[PDB]
Amino acid sequence: TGIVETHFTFKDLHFKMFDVGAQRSERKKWIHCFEGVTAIIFCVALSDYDLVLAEDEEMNRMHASMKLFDSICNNKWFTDTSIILFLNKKDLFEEKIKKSPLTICYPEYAGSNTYEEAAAYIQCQFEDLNKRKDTKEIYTHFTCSTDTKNVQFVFDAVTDVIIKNNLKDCGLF
Amino acid sequence: LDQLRQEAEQLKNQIRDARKACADATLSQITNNIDPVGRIQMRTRRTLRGHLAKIYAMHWGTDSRLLVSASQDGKLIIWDSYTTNKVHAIPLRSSWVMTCAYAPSGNYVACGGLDNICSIYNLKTREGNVRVSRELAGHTGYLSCCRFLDDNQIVTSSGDTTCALWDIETGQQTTTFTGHTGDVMSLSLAPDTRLFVSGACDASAKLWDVREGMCRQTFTGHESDINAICFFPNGNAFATGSDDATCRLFDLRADQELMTYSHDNIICGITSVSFSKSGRLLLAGYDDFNCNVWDALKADRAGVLAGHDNRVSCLGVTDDGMAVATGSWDSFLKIW
Amino acid sequence: IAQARKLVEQLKMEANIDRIKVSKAAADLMAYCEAHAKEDPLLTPVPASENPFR
Amino acid sequence: EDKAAVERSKMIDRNLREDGEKAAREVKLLLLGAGESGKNTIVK
Amino acid sequence: VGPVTIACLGALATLFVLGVFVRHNATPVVKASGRELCYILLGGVFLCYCMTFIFIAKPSTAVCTLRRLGLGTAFSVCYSALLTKTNRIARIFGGAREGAQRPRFISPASQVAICLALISGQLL
């Protein structure tokens, strides 16, 4: 159906969560309509890295996620909006890292058998371009899906982006 | 099969070659002579205030003396030029609305948005305001445009590349057509309810009949998506609104391309195209605040006007050329 | 197969009418668009005397 | 009857003015990601 | 001799500060002041430093008139410049938590309007 809006006033602020709505149409047509948003949420699964359901035999889900992230960051409409890094891997990724050598993410792997170095590598590799980093801050959080949906981190991020936009247009930075 | 596609596309090449051969004389005739035009063609009317949102599209499809526009804050706008005020301000359930329409009788107002819901509002009511709007669905793609010539049949588009014809009384999917590769962006109401036009990539100005239903008119040559389309005041003509800033007149009977006024003076695309009267003044929006109006008959720019500090999105012209309505995201509505 | 046949069928029948759709199109091109091309361009310039706006 | 139109023009502006900062104060977000990328995993 | 030399030293110091800030408006610390109320405060300080010349002068109808309103205006300018910056910073940092929207009357020009209104109250 259409886009689903979830309005919840938790953390003393009227949060509104807007989904993609499964448009399955031209990207820009619904990208430019959402202009004026304060912050966006970027969700990528980490424990399902072995899944190759994105393409039959051409690419994997990692390539699609990286391409979509690059398109979002390089887009001229959202060059100033901050971005949020979320995931849904609390312990499944850690359990899978025991058997998976973490070599599919990068062919030139130079890490151990754990996943801390893999997380560091992916989080430092996400920001391929640094021009938008100065204009818009990038927030990254790991071990998501807490009790109250990680209310503390999202509240801190939203208040930080709000104050940043407030001081940007008043000639204070 | 492969053989069927091959024979079909040799047939298409033969057909387009024949059309070019037959229309070369017409192209030479139209390009040989031009008519004189004015210098500015401008007369200011007023300024509109009382808005704090963005706008996408409007619809000047009524013989009365009012204007209608839609905003993303959730409220519709029905303004008068002289009064610079609104008769009523009804709210909109949808968060975003991109479709705006009005009735010649001033009784029904059509709006819709990303929720795949086409809502018809009651402009005239006993209480003076509409209590609620009826819900219509049946699509998997985002709503793009909707038009109607009466209170019996309504045409609408979707992001799933299909044109839906519905009836107010029935309230169900009455007519549905198979779609092309690209998504339909806009539809133009026919002067006498003959056919409606859909525009997308590789399907520039594809005409579909309302009664018979089959496709007869299809043109190719505009790779970029076409944003806005409108019928000529004289009738039996098309409009080109490709995102590649390509502006070229088209004919229904000719089924062939015409002269193009592309130039290096601009580097961005266009968002809307509109005729003043029989192509006397081509009005087209651009990605910048600055705007220009061309003269198709004179093959030159009629004038330059911006009236905004941000990219303009909506543009409408009265059928009799009484007034033109335009607007950008700066919540400014100016009649040029 | 079946889907491609419908696309071929639509293109096959469209060319049939389009082949005979000329019907001396140039006569219409130079006879249709001048009917209303002289009213509005002269009507729009008003010296703030009969214009309904302002 | 022109006075009534002006009076009506005053109350529509006030009605639209109230909805201005009321909707602006409400923060809007944007959720976008890969297909089935834990849409229901996060508490909503 | 004492007052005039100390006034000259203060005027030179504030002129040097003005030249530094007007030419080094790239580091965010000087931008965090506001870059309008800072100039207003510098003008007030310059008026305070140069008012002693009016103070030590031959009495006259013009001299007496100037030294009557200046004694309040010079300090009111600085006080308003200090007040508006703190007020805008506090309002911006307070209204972010509740009602996420642009605070009213905050701008490089609007704050100047408020500061000049506060000064004009004392002038009136």
Numbering used by the authors:
A (entry chain A): 182 to 354
B (entry chain B): 4 to 339
C (entry chain C): 9 to 62
D (entry chain A): 8 to 51
E (entry chain 2): 569 to 692
What does the paper say about this structure?
The metabotropic glutamate receptors (mGlus) play critical roles in modulating synaptic transmission and neuronal excitability, and dimerization is mandatory for these receptors to exert their functions. In addition to homodimers, these class C G protein-coupled receptors (GPCRs) were shown to form heterodimers as well. Here we report twelve cryo-electron microscopy (cryo-EM) structures of the mGlu2–mGlu3 and mGlu2–mGlu4 heterodimers in different conformational states, including inactive, intermediate inactive, intermediate active and fully active conformations. The Venus flytrap domains undergo a sequential conformational change, while the transmembrane domains exhibit a substantial rearrangement from an inactive, symmetric dimer with diverse dimerization patterns to an active, asymmetric dimer in a conserved dimerization mode.
